[PDB]
Design a protein around this ligand. Structure first.
Ligand SMILES: *[C@@H]1O[C@H](CO[C@@H]2O[C@@H](C)[C@@H](O)[C@@H](O)[C@@H]2O)[C@@H](O[C@@H]2O[C@H](CO)[C@@H](O[C@@H]3O[C@H](CO[C@H]4O[C@H](CO)[C@@H](O)[C@H](O)[C@@H]4O)[C@@H](O)[C@H](O[C@H]4O[C@H](CO)[C@@H](O)[C@H](O)[C@@H]4O)[C@@H]3O)[C@H](O)[C@H]2NC(C)=O)[C@H](O[C@@H]2O[C@@H](C)[C@@H](O)[C@@H](O)[C@@H]2O)[C@H]1NC(C)=O
Ligand SMILES: CCCCCCCCCCCCCCCCCCC[C@@H](O)[C@@H](CCCCCCCCCCCCCC)C(=O)OC[C@@H]1O[C@@H](O)[C@H](O)[C@@H](O)[C@@H]1O
Ligand SMILES: CCCCCCCCCCCCCCCCCCCCCCCCOC(=O)CCCCCCCCCCCCCCC
Ligand SMILES: *[C@@H]1O[C@H](CO)[C@@H](O)[C@H](O)[C@H]1NC(C)=O
Ligand SMILES: [Cl-]
Ligand SMILES: [Cl-]
Ligand code: NA
Lengths: 97, 280
């Protein structure tokens, strides 16, 4: 009955340290629709994150895109944190260039 | 013509308990959002200057009034049905309705509804058709709905008369954005793959519009059949991202290239070459 989200973290452009880019977190295949998504920089919630309005696929699974401008560096860690009824606790998926 | 060929409206109505339900709605051209539904105002948000297509302000307001009345009436009807039947809270209902322009010019309309993420009903040639997944509950719902005067008639007009003229008007109004050409960029990456002496090569392709694209791993002119296409992922601002992977034996990656063909490239395919020994 309930469907756990798939979480995909990717950058808009190939990563280059010091060059501005966009970090995307695509959350999909989940049911029901209620979900909490945050983009993190070094384990802290980024405030300037935008997101799509709710939509769903042909099989009725919901999906959302969360994104923010980011300037990757050698040290900084970025991630997507998701909470949903199907998850025991928030699931963190790290961005890996 | 290129770009989207369909318009649809979607509904997600979330029922928390017998007295509390909330609806989210939006309008789309294929995967591109053009309308939002503002629950604070009971009106539509027009996301593009051309989102009203060739419709007058009066027709747009009459349609918003129909959706406003529907969203209110629907929640009340479901809460009544849920009580009469074996429905446990919380539950979610989804709906999708719209039309699409096919090759040859025919416009086909559709309406589908779901309960609990499973098919529940559809509208096939102006009547309510229960889906087998919906079982007896869908049969009773369709029989109840057709008893309410004017409903099926309003559905028929919206689907078969209003939607087709709307779609044509909006595909023309939005053509400069819908039929625009945006060039992708591409890059390579690699990593270990399951099993001894296996490598996975990845060809990333990002920023292309419209959606149709061709990406393949190659050895000279030989297309590698083993190329696996990932699902096309969205970027913000109406562009797409795709990963095309190839599993190869270690020591057999040299000689591989990734070729990208896209409508925006004017016949200049992107060709990336994988190099061994960390020479990427
Ligand atoms: C928004 O745009 C819609 C689409 O417009 C067309 O496409 C866009 C992209 C632009 O290129 C436009 O310039 C272009 O018009 C409008 O809807 C369309 O309106 C036209 C013009 O009224 C209409 O054509 C009429 O069609 C009927 C036949 O229709 C039936 O049969 C066809 C198959 O053959 C079928 O596809 C239809 O669904 C119907 O079953 C025909 O009898 C008419 O002929 C009469 O008029 C012409 C002059 O126009 C004359 O030469 C003839 O001799 C005769 O008197 C005429 O050809 C299209 O059918 C219609 N398209 C659709 C899919 O509905 C839309 O117009 C408004 O709605 C219409 C239904 C009609 O009531 C119009 O009066 C309205 O303005 C427009 N605006 C809005 C608000 O929707
Ligand atoms: C610019 C963007 C625009 C895009 C344009 C494209 C067109 C979109 C095409 C997609 C089609 C969208 C379909 C949405 C559904 C609209 C339904 C309208 C109903 C109202 O109608 C209806 C509202 C009351 C709701 C009653 C609860 C039942 C709800 C279950 C309906 C299931 C759906 C049917 C499937 C079997 C009504 O009974 O309302 C009162 C009516 O209006 C009065 O004026 C009239 O006098 C009365 O007799 C009627 O009863
Ligand atoms: C104007 C701009 C457009 C934005 C407005 C948003 C539009 C929202 C309305 C969408 C209508 C979708 C039509 C699909 C109807 C859904 C049918 O619902 C069911 O299947 C009922 C399920 C009943 C379960 C039993 C209780
Ligand atoms: C239903 O849920 C709402 C919102 O969570 C709450 O305010 C309300 O009092 C609940 N009512 C019932 C039927 O118990
Ligand atoms: Cl497209
Ligand atoms: Cl080589
Ligand atoms: Na978990």
């Amino acid at each position: 009955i309930q469907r756990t989200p798939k979480i995909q973290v990717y950058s808009r452009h190939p990563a280059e340290n010091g060059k501005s880019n966009f970090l995307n977190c695509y959350v999909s295949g989940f049911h029901p629709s209620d979900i909490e998504v945050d983009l993190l920089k070094n384990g802290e919630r980024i405030e300037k994150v935008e997101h799509s309005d709710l939509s769903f696929s042909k099989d009725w699974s919901f999906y959302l895109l969360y994104y923010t401008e980011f300037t990757p560096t050698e040290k900084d860690e970025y991630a997507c944190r998701v909470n949903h009824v199907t998850l025991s606790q928030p699931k963190i998926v790290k961005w890996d260039r | 013509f290129q770009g989207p060929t369909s318009f649809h409206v979607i509904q997600t109505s979330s029922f928390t308990n017998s007295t509390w339900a909330q609806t989210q709605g939006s309008g789309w051209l294929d995967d591109l959002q053009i309308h939002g539904w503002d629950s604070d105002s009971g009106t539509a948000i027009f996301l593009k200057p051309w989102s009203k297509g060739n419709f007058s302000d009066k027709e747009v307001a009459e349609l918003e009034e129909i959706f406003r009345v529907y969203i209110f009436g629907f929640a009340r009807e479901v809460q009544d049905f849920a009580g009469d039947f074996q429905m446990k809270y919380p539950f979610e209902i989804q709906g999708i309705a719209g039309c699409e322009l096919h090759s040859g010019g025919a416009i086909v309309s559709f309406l589908r509804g779901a309960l609990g993420g499973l098919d529940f009903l559809s509208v096939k040639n102006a009547s309510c058709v229960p889906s087998p997944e919906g079982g007896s509950r869908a049969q009773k719902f369709c029989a109840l709905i057709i008893q309410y005067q004017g409903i099926m008639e309003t559905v028929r007009i919206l689907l078969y008369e209003t939607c087709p003229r709307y779609l044509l008007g909006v595909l023309n109004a939005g053509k400069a954005d819908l039929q625009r050409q945006v060039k992708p960029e591409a890059w390579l990456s690699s990593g270990p793959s399951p099993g001894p002496g296996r490598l996975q090569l990845v060809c990333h392709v990002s920023g292309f519009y419209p959606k149709p694209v061709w990406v393949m791993w190659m050895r000279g002119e030989q297309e590698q059949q083993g190329t696996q296409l990932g699902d096309i992922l969205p970027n913000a601002n109406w562009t797409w991202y795709l990963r095309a992977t190839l599993d190869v034996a270690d020591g057999e990656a040299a000689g591989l290239s990734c070729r990208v063909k896209h409508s925006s490239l004017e016949g200049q395919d992107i060709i990336l070459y994988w190099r061994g020994s960390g020479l990427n």
